[model samples]
Target: LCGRVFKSGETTYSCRDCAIDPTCVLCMDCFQDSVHKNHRYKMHTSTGGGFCDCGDTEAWKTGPFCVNHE
Candidate 1:
């Protein structure tokens, strides 16, 4: 969703790395068995991309995703 505007209730999803796309961003409302599951994205964030950081939990500082993908 480059330079795209989503509605007030729209859901934002982003992916950092994939074999096919470098920068992938989507303004979607819901999820259903997506390839992005391994990409490690969080729903409803302002922007898409980068690692999750486990959303204030820092689980990887304690687990592939946040640390491995980086």
Candidate 2:
């Protein structure tokens, strides 16, 4: 997904709106919400290293690491 060439066993999940939206709208939302409003949500990897999971609505931008813009 997102042009990412995953290897075998590398689980991936599409963003909620990526199927219809042109770009990664959810990622953009996560970025803005984190920077401006000081939200606590964050995108994280699953235990087995699957798709990135964004935190709940209340803490939508707080993550262990900053969003990988690049």
Candidate 3:
């Protein structure tokens, strides 16, 4: 399904099912079930297509591009 990419500091929501509930827990099931689950979100440059660490509480460290896909 066509979906928009998430950027740094951008807020995204899950599908209706997840959004319906006040406590929307992020999980693989929610992601897969969401309308834009397959969609890619804004990626941080540091991660290089990996999990973004921009807002993480831990120390910020840039990770290499995921080579498994390539």
Candidate 4:
């Protein structure tokens, strides 16, 4: 909402904690800037389009020893 607007059919990503309610939808830029990085959010399409599928980024939510996923 602040940085960039969602494009037509543009996809998005979010985390479990962020999606606890209807107001939890988020943009990729905000997603990366958020402290929720520790929350290990899952990748999912919002409307579906060309975007950084951070959700496509795979890792273990339990054992997060490696660096952040791209």
Best by TM-score: 4
Give the TM-scores of the predictions, in the order they appear.
0.33, 0.25, 0.21, 0.45
- How would you encode candidate 2's per-residue C-alpha lDDT over 22-64 as one tens digit per residue? 1222333334433322432233232342232234332222232
Screening candidate 4 with a backbone cut-off below 3 angstroms (N, C-alpha, C), the clashing residue pairs are: 43-55
- C-alpha lDDT of residue 44 in model 3: 19
lDDT of model 4 at position 51? 36
For all candidates, the clash counts are 1, 5, 2, 1
Write model 3 residue lDDT over 14-62, tens digit each, in one string: 2332232322222232233433343332211221212321222121122
Worst lDDT run of 10 residues, candidate 4, spans 57-66
The alpha-carbon root-mean-square deviation between model 4 and the true structure, to one decimal in Å, is 9.4
Q: For residue 61, what is the lDDT in candidate 4?
A: 30
lDDT of each: 0.38, 0.31, 0.27, 0.45
Candidate 4, residue 7: the lDDT equals 70
Model 3's TM-score against the true structure: 0.21
Off by over 4 Å in 1: 1-5, 19-23, 29-33, 42-70
lDDT of 3 at 29: 26
RMSD of each: 11.4, 10.4, 12.8, 9.4
Q: lDDT (0-100) at residue 19 of candidate 2?
A: 24
